[PDB]
Amino acid sequence: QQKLDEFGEQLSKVISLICVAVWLINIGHFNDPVHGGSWIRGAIYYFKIA
Amino acid sequence: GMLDPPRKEVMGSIQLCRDAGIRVIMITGDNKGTAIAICRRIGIFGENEEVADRAYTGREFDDLPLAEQREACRRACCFARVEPSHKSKIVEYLQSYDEITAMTGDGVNDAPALKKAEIGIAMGSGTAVAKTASEMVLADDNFSTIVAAVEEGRAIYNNMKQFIRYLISSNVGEVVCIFLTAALGLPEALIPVQLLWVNLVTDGLPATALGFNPPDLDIMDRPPRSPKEPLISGWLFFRYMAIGGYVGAATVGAAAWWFMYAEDGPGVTYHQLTHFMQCTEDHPHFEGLDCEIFEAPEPMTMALSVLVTIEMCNALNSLSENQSLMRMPPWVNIWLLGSICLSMSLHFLILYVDPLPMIFKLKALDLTQWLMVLKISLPVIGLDEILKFIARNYLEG
Amino acid sequence: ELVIEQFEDLLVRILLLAACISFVLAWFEEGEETITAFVEPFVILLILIA
Amino acid sequence: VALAVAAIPEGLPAVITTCLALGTRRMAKKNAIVRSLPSVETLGCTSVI
Numbered sequence: 001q002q003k004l005d006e007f008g009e010q011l012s013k014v015i016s017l018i019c020v021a022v023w024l025i026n027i028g029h030f031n032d033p034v035h036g037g038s039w040i041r042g043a044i045y046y047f048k049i050a
Numbered sequence: 051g052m053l054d055p056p057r058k059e060v061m062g063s064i065q066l067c068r069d070a071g072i073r074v075i076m077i078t079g080d081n082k083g084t085a086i087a088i089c090r091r092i093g094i095f096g097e098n099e100e101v102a103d104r105a106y107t108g109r110e111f112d113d114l115p116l117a118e119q120r121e122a123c124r125r126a127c128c129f130a131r132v133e134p135s136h137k138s139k140i141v142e143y144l145q146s147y148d149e150i151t152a153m154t155g156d157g158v159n160d161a162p163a164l165k166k167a168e169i170g171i172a173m174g175s176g177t178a179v180a181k182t183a184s185e186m187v188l189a190d191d192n193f194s195t196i197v198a199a200v201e202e203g204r205a206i207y208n209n210m211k212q213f214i215r216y217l218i219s220s221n222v223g224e225v226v227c228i229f230l231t232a233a234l235g236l237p238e239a240l241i242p243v244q245l246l247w248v249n250l251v252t253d254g255l256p257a258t259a260l261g262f263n264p265p266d267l268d269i270m271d272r273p274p275r276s277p278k279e280p281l282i283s284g285w286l287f288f289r290y291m292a293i294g295g296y297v298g299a300a301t302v303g304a305a306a307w308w309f310m311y312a313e314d315g316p317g318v319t320y321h322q323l324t325h326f327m328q329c330t331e332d333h334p335h336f337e338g339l340d341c342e343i344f345e346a347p348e349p350m351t352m353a354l355s356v357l358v359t360i361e362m363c364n365a366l367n368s369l370s371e372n373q374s375l376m377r378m379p380p381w382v383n384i385w386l387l388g389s390i391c392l393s394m395s396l397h398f399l400i401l402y403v404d405p406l407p408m409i410f411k412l413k414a415l416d417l418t419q420w421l422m423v424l425k426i427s428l429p430v431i432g433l434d435e436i437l438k439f440i441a442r443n444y445l446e447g
Numbered sequence: 448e449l450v451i452e453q454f455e456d457l458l459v460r461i462l463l464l465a466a467c468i469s470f471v472l473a474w475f476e477e478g479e480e481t482i483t484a485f486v487e488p489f490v491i492l493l494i495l496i497a
Numbered sequence: 498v499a500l501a502v503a504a505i506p507e508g509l510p511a512v513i514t515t516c517l518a519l520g521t522r523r524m525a526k527k528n529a530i531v532r533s534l535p536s537v538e539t540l541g542c543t544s545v546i
């Protein structure tokens with residue numbers, strides 16, 4: 001159980017580490033003011049892979 | 051019925067020059083009649099355009115009053131029955147308007163004008179005289195080569211403009227540093243031997259790398275730049291004016307820092323470091339330590355490190371004039387990256403390799419030390435990054 | 448004649464003047480580090496000649 | 498001598514030559530042989546041919 005709880009504590013950190021990494025992989029989206037990238041549409045994408 | 055026909059690419063090439071805001075004037079020893087007819091075939095004149103006041107024989111041009119001759123040169127696109135002198139004269143009038151003028155030809159009758167013009171361009175299959183009197187030669191007699199040379203010329207100048215501003219911006223900060231310590235009474239923060247290494251190798255590579263920055267796309271869709279366009283002026287003056295002061299205080303600062311708040315040689319936290327001269331003379335004054343602590347190669351290494359680190363940052367800031375690195379990433383010019391890496395690798399070399407730091411009067415610094423330099427240097431990027439933001443918004447753009 | 452014209456530039460002259468002044472101040476220093484004192488004069492000279 | 502050396506960009510001329518020399522070789526590929534390095538800069542500035 002200690003081993004399984006440990007795995008969980010580490011896992012939550014790795015996921016976060018990724019969710020933040022993916023955010024950095026797509027920073028260039030602040031260079032295209034077209035309507036095809038409103039705050040709502042893009043947000044859904046991160047909360048989609050999250 | 052026969053004629054001396056225009057080359058195939060000519061018409062197209064004339065259009066491209068026109069798109070780049072470049073005018074084309076025909077100056078020929080041939081007769082007016084055929085000179086105009088060729089002008090129409092290649093697009094210098096319209097099919098049914100009226101050229102009564104846009105085409106002249108050399109004599110007709112000479113008869114015009116001294117005043118109107120100059121104007122005719124800005125209006126007319128065809129000069130015929132000309133003598134060698136007429137060509138250089140026409141070129142001279144053009145230059146009287148401060149216009150950068152080019153001359154293309156192949157005959158010895160073009161030599162004078164090819165000499166007079168800023169850019170003499172000879173045909174690859176033309177006479178030796180024309181060639182030896184020119185700045186360039188079109189190895190393939192193709193007029194399109196001119197356009198490509200103009201594009202290359204514009205691109206090369208935009209890059210030169212960058213590394214020129216870069217290297218010269220650096221020299222500004224260095225002067226501030228030498229002046230700060232001079233009036234602040236502080237000791238030598240940077241010796242000449244160090245500056246030379248920075249303005250030749252440290253910044254040398256970065257500068258060269260800037261010469262290979264990617265050229266703009268609309269470069270041939272813009273008119274010619276004014277010959278009097280200053281490299282640094284206006285907001286860029288103040289901007290570089292600010293960047294200079296920072297580097298001047300970051301170096302003189304990181305140097306005075308070691309002398310007071312560093313855990314390697316504390317000094318008078320009351321700024322009495324200003325009297326480091328009155329140490330060997332009146333030791334029992336407010337010293338209590340070896341006076342050779344001022345000639346210590348530790349603080350200077352702190353100054354140089356900041357200088358070097360700042361420059362490498364200002365090198366990435368030179369990739370563009372008013373564009374944030376967020377828009378134009380530092381990796382847009384791979385040669386620039388490999389450039390900064392080669393400069394830093396040579397900085398560590400000038401510190402560790404004993405035979406060097408003894409000459410440049412330096413001394414390697416530990417991890418904690420570098421972490422400091424990265425706190426007075428790195429912020430220079432955000433500094434200029436802000437100044438840019440102010441230009442493309444609060445200003446014209 | 449070509450060489451003489453290489454030293455007509457103002458800055459190249461100022462840099463040359465600084466070289467000589469730097470060479471004079473060289474003969475006025477302790478003998479603990481003299482082998483690494485005439486570097487500035489030579490370097491600034493090696494460049495101008497380059 | 499410190500102010501002099503600090504104000505004058507010692508390497509500027511070496512950067513220019515290298516740039517121009519490499520740019521010329523690139524132009525030669527475009528079939529434009531440049532006999533005068535300083536001309537490269539002036540060409541792009543041409544307003545009248």
Ligand SMILES: C/C=C(/C)C(=O)O[C@H]1C(C)=C2[C@H]([C@@H]1OC(=O)CCCCCCC)[C@@](C)(OC(C)=O)C[C@H](OC(=O)CCC)[C@@]1(O)[C@H]2OC(=O)[C@@]1(C)O
Pocket residue numbers: 214218219221222223225226229280281282283287288290291294503504505
């Ligand atoms: C190299 C280093 C320095 C510090 C130098 O003296 O450069 C000045 C100077 C001569 C000019 C200036 C420098 O001016 C100042 O820094 C203002 C005076 C305060 C200095 C006080 C010292 C603590 C350039 C360098 O810099 C800034 C940052 O404003 C920009 C520009 O130069 C260009 O456009 C380059 C042309 C090859 C020139 O105003 C130029 O004068 C001209 O005729 C120009 C048109 O050339």
Ligand code: NA
Pocket residue numbers: 164165166167168169170183184185
């Ligand atoms: Na010429």
